[PDB]
Amino acid sequence: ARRRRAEVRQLQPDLVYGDVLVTAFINKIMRDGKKNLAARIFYDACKIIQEKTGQEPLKVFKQAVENVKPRMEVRSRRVGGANYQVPMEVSPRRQQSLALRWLVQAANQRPERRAAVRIAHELMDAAEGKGGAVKKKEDVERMAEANRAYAHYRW
Amino acid sequence: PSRKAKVKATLGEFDLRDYRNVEVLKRFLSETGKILPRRRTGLSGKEQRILAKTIKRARILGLLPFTEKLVRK
């Protein structure tokens, strides 16, 4: 992107919750364009969070995401023969991106054999404040901050 | 910029050679005992040069300062 600033693709609201953030999460889950297989996985998970929990799946979702968003991160830079982890605030658009990506990433690290279960648990497990997705989010924030000395390199 | 007011204008008739008139001479020094430039004193090459000797003269006697502490930064 050297000329313009690329406008963000606007997604199609969820087939069930009419939410755009859901389509995203689904997309991230999807691999090899198997959007059907993807969608189902998320949904089955929604029904799994619906059981083991009394709270609505949609709301559990929102929360987890919110909990896994990083508000700070270190972006490496060159300064007179040396690379520095420069803490940088994190763009809202990028937060949602990193959050959704991480959940799925962490989710597939889990031990439970069934996909939907892994998403299910990771998701609810996230809204609880725990889970590997949230640990990544924290390690990142710990990374930033911990280099506040190189913060004057605003970037 | 620098359109505040040339010291010469912001003042009456005076004897540039009077090295003892603190009350007036002092008006030609910055927030720091530094001798103001022509763009600020509105004097001519010749006057400015005389003022210079006059001020340095006072300073030695004890009437004017050589350097003052800045009060802000």
Added chain:
Amino acid sequence: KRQVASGRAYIHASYNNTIVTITDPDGNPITWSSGGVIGYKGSRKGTPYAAQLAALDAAKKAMAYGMQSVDVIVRGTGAGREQAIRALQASGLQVKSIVDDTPVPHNGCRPKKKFRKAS
């Protein structure tokens, strides 16, 4: 353990460090701090953050003697300079005033090569 209340804060900024010294109403060191005092070794000390941490370290150790008001004196043109000031104001101490007193000769000693190449 000597109660002073009001005093002076000397910020010694430079390109390799920022050391702060807090003195009584007439120049005597009550407590001091520096980039190295807080832990940073090497170039880290010069950073403005270090400055902040140092100014704060000084202040906290200052109020221990019941300090509340301070007159700030800044010497140097280092990086921490402005941060250290910011730090103090937000330390709890009252910044009664700020005056820059960096020393400058009216030309005296030949500077070292690294500071010459000048006219």
Added chain:
RNA sequence: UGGGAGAGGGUGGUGGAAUUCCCGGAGUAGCGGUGAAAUGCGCAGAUACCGGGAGGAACGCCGAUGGCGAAGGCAGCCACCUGGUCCACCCGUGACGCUGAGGCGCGAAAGCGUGGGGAGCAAACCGGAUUAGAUACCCGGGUAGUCCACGCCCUAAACGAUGCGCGCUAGGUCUCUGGGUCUCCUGGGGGCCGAAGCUAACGCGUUAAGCGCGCCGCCUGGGGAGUACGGCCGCAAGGC
């Protein structure tokens, strides 16, 4: 004769800022330094603060695109001694002029001799880094020297890379310094841009690189070579 501007020169005398060192107070654990670091310095208390003293070297702002000097070069302030110079009046002498081989004097920096001085800086040198390797560039130390007196050396990108004097040939603009009736006029300097013209071109252009006269110095393809030899000068380095 009257008056002007100026870091022009020489001699004393003085002022304030800063660095270093020493004394005292108060204060802890570092400081310093770099791309990053070490060497180094610090609990026989450093760094950072405040007070006192000693010493040496230089002179901030003003100070410019400024000023003065034949050149090299000359800036804190005061006094003395002193060179050049510009203007006004048109008063005196009546070419008394220009140039200038030799000669003589002056001549930045480094360097030399004798004796002083020595704070900061710093060839050499001692270390720490960097690097393929650094006899370097960066960092910590540091002697000659840098400063003074007297004597010597006599070189340079000693440059406007343009010898000195005189007369002649549009103007515009800025500026320093005189005199005038002071929008401006008239001198003496410093800069830009430009008539004519000149120039290989770049450029120069009433500070000429134009148009002319006078006198001096110098050039004659590159390398060898500012070398060898000889002479002269110098304590030497070395210079001509």
